[PDB]
Amino acid sequence: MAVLRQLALLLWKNYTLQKRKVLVTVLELFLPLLFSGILIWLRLKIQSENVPNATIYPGQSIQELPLFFTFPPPGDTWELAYIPSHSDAAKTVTETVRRALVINMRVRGFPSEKDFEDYIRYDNCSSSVLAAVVFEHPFNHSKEPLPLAVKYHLRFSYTRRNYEGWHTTSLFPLFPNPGPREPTSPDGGEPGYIREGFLAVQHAVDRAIMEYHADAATRQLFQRLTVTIKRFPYPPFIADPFLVAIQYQLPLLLLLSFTYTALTIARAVVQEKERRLKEYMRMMGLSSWLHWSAWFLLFFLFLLIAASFMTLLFCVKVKPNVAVLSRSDPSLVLAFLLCFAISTISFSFMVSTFFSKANMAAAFGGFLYFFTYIPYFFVAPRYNWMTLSQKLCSCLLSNVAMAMGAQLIGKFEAKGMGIQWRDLLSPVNVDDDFCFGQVLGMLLLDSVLYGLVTWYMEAVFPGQFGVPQPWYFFIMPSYWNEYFEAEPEDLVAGIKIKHLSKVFRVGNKDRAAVRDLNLNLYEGQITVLLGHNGAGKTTTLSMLTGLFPPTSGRAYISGYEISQDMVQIRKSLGLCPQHDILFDNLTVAEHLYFYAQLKGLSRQKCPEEVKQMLHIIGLEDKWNSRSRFLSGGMRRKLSIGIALIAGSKVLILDQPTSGMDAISRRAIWDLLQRQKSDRTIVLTTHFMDEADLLGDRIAIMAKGELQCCGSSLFLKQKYGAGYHMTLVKEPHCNPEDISQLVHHHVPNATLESSAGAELSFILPRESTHRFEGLFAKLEKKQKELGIASFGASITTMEEVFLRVGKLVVKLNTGLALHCQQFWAMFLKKAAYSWREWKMVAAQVLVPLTCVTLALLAINYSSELFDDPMLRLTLGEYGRTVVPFSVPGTSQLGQQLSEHLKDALQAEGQEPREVLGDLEEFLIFRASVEGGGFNERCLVAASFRDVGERTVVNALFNNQAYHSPATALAVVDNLLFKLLCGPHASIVVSNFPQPRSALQAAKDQFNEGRKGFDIALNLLFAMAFLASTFSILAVSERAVQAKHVQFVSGVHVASFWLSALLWDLISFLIPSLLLLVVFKAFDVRAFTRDGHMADTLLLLLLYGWAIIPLMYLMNFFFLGAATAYTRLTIFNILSGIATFLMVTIMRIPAVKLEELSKTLDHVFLVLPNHCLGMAVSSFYENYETRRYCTSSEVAAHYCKKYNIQYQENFYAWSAPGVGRFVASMAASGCAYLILLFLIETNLLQRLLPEDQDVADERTRILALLHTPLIIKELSKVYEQRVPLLAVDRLSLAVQKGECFGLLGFNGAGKTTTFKMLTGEESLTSGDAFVGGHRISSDRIGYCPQFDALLDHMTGREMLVMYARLRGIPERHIGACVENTLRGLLLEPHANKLVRTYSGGNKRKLSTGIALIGEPAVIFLDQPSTGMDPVARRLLWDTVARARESGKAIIITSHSMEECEALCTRLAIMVQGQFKCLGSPQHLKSKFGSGYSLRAKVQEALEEFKAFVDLTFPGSVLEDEHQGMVHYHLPWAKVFGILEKAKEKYGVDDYSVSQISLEQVFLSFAHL
């Protein structure tokens, strides 16, 4: 029941996410209609004729040869032959035949048929033979007589001889058009059969047989009757030349409308597992088959609306009874489209499981969809030769199975009835056995076949974020030291780690991340894991939670062996990652509700729980606000809320409180204290008071190995000595002054590190007596040496970490500046094709296999074979009916009709007397029966007499090919039977002659579709190649690595021209690899006289005109993968769709050619259309020029009909590419201009507060040496409820200073930096940096969130910014080493900044903002994920950069740096300042410069008595069950605690001058 209660949850989530992008949804829901509207518009344009009256034809006469064979061929006379030559009968028959055909002819003779075939194809005196009678009889010893039952062939020519062959491969034309097959020519048609004298010779031989058998009765017979042949009259019809036009590319219009959802599904499924959003929901509890179901139900509704709109505008009558698919029962069309939609969803699901990156999934799942359709180019021509097995074997691809259904829809449509639910098992004609149900069967078998592949790949090859399974997973039935403390035996071990390890694949050396871990974490207490930046701590936690498998070892979360069955562990797991994983466009209460329901919590008690969590975390006013906005410190709060909601037995937190203010860290600490009773908790943290306040056992990792493990006291009394003391010096101070005094008073002590203004000391316990003197000595003389805010404590935790770690120039400008900024960007872009070589592979191979498989299917479909033998008899068609009439009541007419009646019934046919004027009966039945009349009535007879002489008409249905011969054979059969015995028949066959070798080398015309196919398969390749030039340009702006580059001062021309130049170089390679292909296949129009350069010019000119456009179009998008799949469809609409429409709309048969001019003039502004038409015209012009020049015999024919070719190849006139070249050349310039006009913002114009805060608003309002000036600055975010983020924020900073700018979470800091730099827009304010105003018109920038290029390494990212700011090439190695070494990045100097750590990216992002020595510097939380050792080096760098006169404005949350390197603090809340002045000013506000902090109900209450009766006037606050904090109103308070510990029950204490954090907390209740 939970499964159905969770499927509804997933569906609700998908519906909510879709509801908030309606423009995108409506847009992509009506893209499939721009391909099916082409047809519904063409159907209004093209019109019918409706011929009203029937068509009649006159008879012929087959007594003699046509009036063309009386003239002998040039050179000799006509020649005749017979195959059995060793028999006298076979010669005496042919002699009679020769006499009958009264011309000059000569006979021959051969010993077999093989000799005749060779003489035809291996000689030159041949090719004058007329026919060749072949008798199929054994014929012993030249004395055998002709049997009663004779049969023979007639070998006629292979070419149309009487001014395509004989079509003996089929009985009906493949695709028939309405009206008579040959409207004129009342003598037959395409195979002729009367022009070539087939009927004449056949009748002569049929009479020769009778003259041989009787010779006396046959003369008396053939003196009173003659046989003549007529044609059926055709009924009235309508003309409508529509279906014939759109028949070859109906499948290409059905595929090209589902293509978009095909390449949307593939990347929408992959970029939500590349984003770690699938592993996250699986970790929190989610069945993997409830996700596929949600995806399927999401993507089936779209294709159900689209498949209904297509069915709607495939059946509605636009004009009375005219609609597309004029009669096809819309139900079955809809069923076909649904059966295609299911399959094209399953195919995308299967494809998406081969890729792990959304870019390659989008670039290779839109290509595989079309790649699956290519083998139809080899099936369409040779469809009449395949077998049913070979037709079902090629239906295993869904696109081919759709193509061979869209073919039958046309074939059934242009015949009669169409598609009707009662023909699912009956083929079209009597020649192919292929039903329509066999298409729907394979289209539904393919879905299952693809599902069985997506079920296996998703389980054995999970990619980069899953934990795999063995290759046989379906077989089993269960699928369906002395630094280390001594472990406690009073607890239960939750997690047990044993010899765990992990090795990565950097370079070729197998560097290790974790190595041989051993640990045990117990239930009911918190274990804190410490370490520096890059020593496990996330590889361990990502391996305990199943994000990727261990290299070796094992671990037992609850006895479950994480590598064996983690599906049981993930029932009670709950975690928060280092970088949050949230849904944009999904509010906060929605997030909490969804993730409480997912885990299992009941629906009754959910809302109160969500309210409790919203109150706890602190997100109250941010309720129902989208996660995309938030702040930066609220993201972590929401993540923690999600992690703790619904309860969990195992909590795994990875840096939870990183980026929050203190007032909320305390609340998080309190909750974690209250929720550790009966669960295990694992923490990784970088604040060293957190690891002491809330921690029962602590572990520290050096470089993948465990250093120490134990409680918080055993560790302190092993590494420190006795105590600690810290100081903060003033500007004019010297360390030796303090050091010598300390040595003279306290001998044994060692300075730790003077990291800025810290200058700390370490003292042992053996010198505890000499404390008061040294304390008073510095108490009295604070001002002399400049010590502000001194403090002392007892061996804090921050020192144990240090002990463990230690134990183991004139800048370029002018020309040389631009020549350097250009080279830097050129290398930045070029190093992107070296690191992701999959993209360059897709750029070089995709455009090539689409052309080498279209030139391969053009050579293949251009060959003829043999014209097999056909048996000309009724009975090849089935059970036909054969009407006849005998009007005239005369003898010899009924005694023939009775023979006709009996012979057919013996054959198996059905006669039908009419008695009533055969012609009108035929016309009426042909109009009432419909299209089924052509399959059951094919011959007829009428026995009429004219003046004592009988005339036998032999009608034939010309809708079939071989009807005349069949009719004449039926007549001659009964004629032979009349005068001989009833067992006497004649059987005739065609079997034409074979083609020779000399006559098979004519091949003059080749235009046909041979240029159209090349130009179409080039467009389908350049649609995919040309979309890859916007991937880097979008992914470099989504990360906001472009905003920092422009802040650092890159000229726009330098940014864009180098990108254009590298893209042109990258585009040149396929344009040079296409020439090799055109040479290999010997395509003449692009290989001959000088056209090799003219083709490359076309390709390079298209590459010049599309590349600037793919830069303009990239401004819409925010994602790199979701821009490929929309630019690809933009390149198809403006390409193939229009080219396909214009080619159809210029056929002579359809009477609309003039409109294809006013459309072709509009489509010139589209750069994809121009290339296709240019290639097509270049191909057509070469052929029409090579034909009107070969000989004068064709030169006059060319001007007979005005073939109209060009000699220039570049003229303006039609068959010359002048205007296409002009329009492609004038588009690149018009796009570069428009891009440079938009990149330079030229198309953009087209209350009693504190006194000190109020004084700054006047000192600047009532300045040449000030780098930065802010006055009356404001910012409002309008969201139907305006939110004021900045309120007048007036202030000014001078040189050599360090402004503080503190605040709470979400107050104003980042949104201030944005306006200062230029990211966001201004409203009612002004400011000046470096003097020059920013409201109208050398600074560094370290943004809050890392904006780095993942394909570059650490040192290259620094070299780029060294080049962007002068720094001559000579003096650059020193300037890079000084920044890598002085920031502790030497180990990671060149390691591809994509595999860096959480803090190893903050180090680099800070090092970028300081290299080059800029004037102003904007730091924005520079140190969040940095450990103490590196956080101290950051302070040294910031101080040494400020002592050299540079304005600096940091923005941080920790306080020990805000007092170690700051000079003018400012606490701002709700978007306005509340205090300014030096930190000493703030601290000496209300005096009482003494504080305390102890650490241990009854014990604390008793220990409060001592400090209450000893320190009256206490204002104590903020206790943490031991952390009672005292703000007393120096050697007189440290000496007190020299005996009050034995009877006070404490272990540590810190007494110091008043804390800055207390001043900060004083503003809390506001």
Ligand X SMILES: Nc1ncnc2c1ncn2[C@@H]1O[C@H](COP(=O)(O)OP(=O)(O)OP(=O)(O)O)[C@@H](O)[C@H]1O
Ligand Y SMILES: *[C@@H]1O[C@H](CO)[C@@H](O)[C@H](O)[C@H]1NC(C)=O
Contacts of ligand Y in 86-115 (CB under 6 A) = none
Q: Which residue, 1344 or 1353, has its beta carbon nearer to Mg ion? A: 1344
Phi and psi at residue 297, in whole multiples of 5°?
Answer: -70, -30
Could you tell me how many residues of this chain bind Mg ion (CB under 5 A)? Answer: 6
Q: Out of 1397, 1478, 1484, 1558, point to the residue binding ligand X (CB under 6 A).
A: 1397
Binding mask 1330-1359 for ligand Y (x = CB under 6 A): ------------------------------
3-state secondary structure of 499: strand
* 3-class DSSP state of 1348: coil
Question: For helices 815-835 and 1052-1080, what crossing angle results, to 10°?
Answer: 50
Is residue 1310 a known part of a binding site?
yes
- Give the separation between CA 736 and CA 1059, rounded to whole angstroms: 56
Q: What stretch of H or E contains 1285?
A: strand 1283-1288
- Decide if 880 contacts 910 (C-beta within 8 A): yes
Which of ligand Y, ligand X, Mg ion, none lies near 124, with the C-beta cut-off 5 to 8 A by kind?
ligand Y
When the beta carbons of 138 and 320 are compared against ligand Y, the nearer one is: 138
Residue 785 DSSP one-character state: H
List, in sequence order, every residue forming a beta bridge with 872; answer none if it has no partner.
988
Among the listed residues 173, 179, 632, 1318, the single contact to ligand X using CB under 6 A: 632
**Residue 87 C-beta: closest distance to ligand Y, Å:** 12
Q: Are 245 and 1141 contacting, i.e. CB atoms less than 8 angstroms apart? A: no
Residue of 454, 712, 1310, 1405 interacting with Mg ion (CB under 5 A): 1310
Nearer to ligand Y, 125 or 946 (CB): 125
Minimal distance, residue 125 CB to ligand Y, in Å? 5
Count CB atoms within 10 A of the CB of residue 1298. Answer: 22
Q: One symbol per residue from 1392 to 1431: x for binding Mg ion (CB under 5 A), - otherwise; what is it? A: ------x---------------------------------
Of residues 1337-1366, those binding Mg ion (CB under 5 A):
1344
Cβ nearer to ligand Y, comparing 125 with 1247: 125
Q: Which segment (9-17, 275-283, 1147-1155, 1304-1312) binds Mg ion by CB under 5 A? A: 1304-1312
The structure tokens listed for 1274 are 């404001």
**Shortest spacing between CB 654 and ligand X, in angstroms:** 8
* Count of residues near ligand X by CB under 6 A: 31
For residue 932, the 8-state DSSP code is G
Q: Minimal distance in Å, beta carbon 140 to ligand Y? A: 4
Distance CA 290, CA 278 (A): 12
Taking CB under 6 A as the rule, which mask of x and - marks residues 1423-1452 in contact with ligand X? --x---------------------------
1103 binds, among Mg ion, ligand X, ligand Y, none (CB under 5 to 8 A by kind): none
Q: Is 535 annotated as ligand-binding?
A: yes
**Pairing label, strands 939-945, 881-885:** parallel
Find, among 528, 934, 567, 955, the residue nearest to 709 by Cα: 528
556 three-class SS = strand
With CB atoms as reference, the residue minimizing the distance to ligand X is: 633
User: Burial letters for 129-162: b for 16+ Cβ neighbours within 10 Å, e otherwise?
Assistant: bbbbbbbebebeeeeeebebebbbbbbbbbeeee
Q: Which part of the chain contacts ligand X (CB under 6 A), choosing from 552-560, 790-798, 831-839, 1395-1403?
A: 1395-1403
By CB under 5 A, residue 218 contacts Mg ion: no
Establish whether 1303 is an annotated binding residue: yes
Residue 1395 neighbours by CB under 8 Å, 6+ apart: 504, 506
- With beta carbons less than 8 A apart as the criterion, state whether 1325 and 1272 touch: yes
Among the candidate windows 535-543, 668-676, 1139-1147, 1182-1190, which touches ligand X by CB under 6 A? 535-543
Q: Where does 664-749 show beta strands of DSSP type E?
A: 680-684, 697-701, 706-710, 723-726
Q: Which residues pair with 989 in a beta bridge?
A: 871
Task: Check binding of 1298 to ligand X (CB under 6 A).
Answer: no
Question: Which positions ≥6 away from 405 have C-beta within 8 Å?
Answer: 336, 340, 436, 439, 440, 443
Region 1302-1321 residues binding ligand X, contact defined as CB under 6 A:
1303, 1305-1311
Quickly count: other Cβ atoms within 10 Å of residue 978's Cβ: 15
**Stretch 140-179 residues interacting with ligand X (CB under 6 A):** none
504 near ligand X, judged by CB under 6 A: yes
Q: Closer to ligand X by CB, 156 or 1396: give it.
A: 1396
Residue 911: in which H helix or E strand, if any? strand 910-913
Identify which of residues 129 and 817 has a Cβ nearer to ligand Y in the complex.
Answer: 129
1119 binds, among Mg ion, ligand Y, ligand X, none (CB under 5 to 8 A by kind): none
Identified binder of ligand X from the candidate list 168, 257, 538, 1184, rule CB under 6 A: 538
Task: Give the separation between CA 241 and CA 183, rounded to whole angstroms.
Answer: 14
**Contact between 125 and ligand Y (CB under 6 A)?**
yes
Q: Does 1470 bind ligand X (CB under 6 A)?
A: no
Q: Which of 1396, 1398, 1417 is nearest to 1408 (CA)?
A: 1417
Per the annotation, does 538 bind a ligand?
A: yes
Partner from ligand X, Mg ion, ligand Y, none contacting 125, C-beta within 5 to 8 A by type: ligand Y
Residues 1168 to 1227 in contact with ligand Y, rule: CB under 6 A: none
- Total residues at interface with ligand Y (CB under 6 A): 4
Is 1305 marked as a binding-site residue?
yes
Closest to 1410 (Cα-Cα) out of 1419, 1421, 1401, 1400: 1419
Q: How many CA atoms lie within 13 A of 458 on its CB side?
A: 20
124 lines the binding site for ligand Y (CB under 6 A) = yes
**Should residue 285 be labelled a site residue for Mg ion when binding is judged by CB under 5 A?**
no
C-alpha dihedral, 837 to 842 to 843 to 847, nearest 10°: 160
104 known member of a binding site: no
Instruction: Choose between 621 and 766: whose C-beta lies nearer to ligand X.
Output: 621
Least distance from C-beta 148 to ligand Y, angstroms? 14
Q: Taking CB under 6 A as the criterion, which residues in 610-629 touch ligand X? A: 629
- Establish if 140 lies at the interface with ligand Y (CB under 6 A): yes
Choose one: 112-120, 356-364, 1309-1317, 1511-1519; the region binding Mg ion (CB under 5 A): 1309-1317
* 340 vs 254: CA distance, rounded Å: 10
537-566 positions binding Mg ion, by CB under 5 A: 538
Ordered DSSP codes for 133-163: EEE----GGGTPPPPSSEEEEE---SS----
- Work out whether 184 is an interface residue with ligand Y (CB under 6 A): no
Q: How far apart are CA 944 and CA 885, in angstroms?
A: 8
Per the annotation, does 1304 bind a ligand? yes
| Token reading at 1069 | 């390679």
Segment 617 to 656, residues that bind Mg ion, using CB under 5 A: 632
What is the smallest separation between the CB atom of 124 and ligand Y, expressed in angstroms?
A: 4
Minimum CB separation of residue 74 from ligand Y in Å reads 12
DSSP letters for 565-596: --TTGGGTEEEE-SS----TT--HHHHHHHHH
- Residue from 52, 74, 138, 1487 in contact with ligand Y (CB under 6 A): 138
Closest CA to 406 of 254, 244, 246, 241: 254
Residues that bind ligand X (CB under 6 A): 504, 506, 513, 533-534, 536-539, 578, 629-633, 1277, 1283, 1285, 1303, 1305-1311, 1395, 1397-1399, 1425
List, as residue ranges, the binding site for ATP: 531-538, 1303-1310
Task: Give the binding site for ligand Y (CB under 6 A).
Answer: 124-125, 138, 140
Instruction: Mark the binding-site residues, compressed into ranges.
Output: 531-538, 1303-1310
Please report, as ranges, the residues that interact with Mg ion according to CB under 5 A.
538, 578, 632, 1310, 1344, 1398
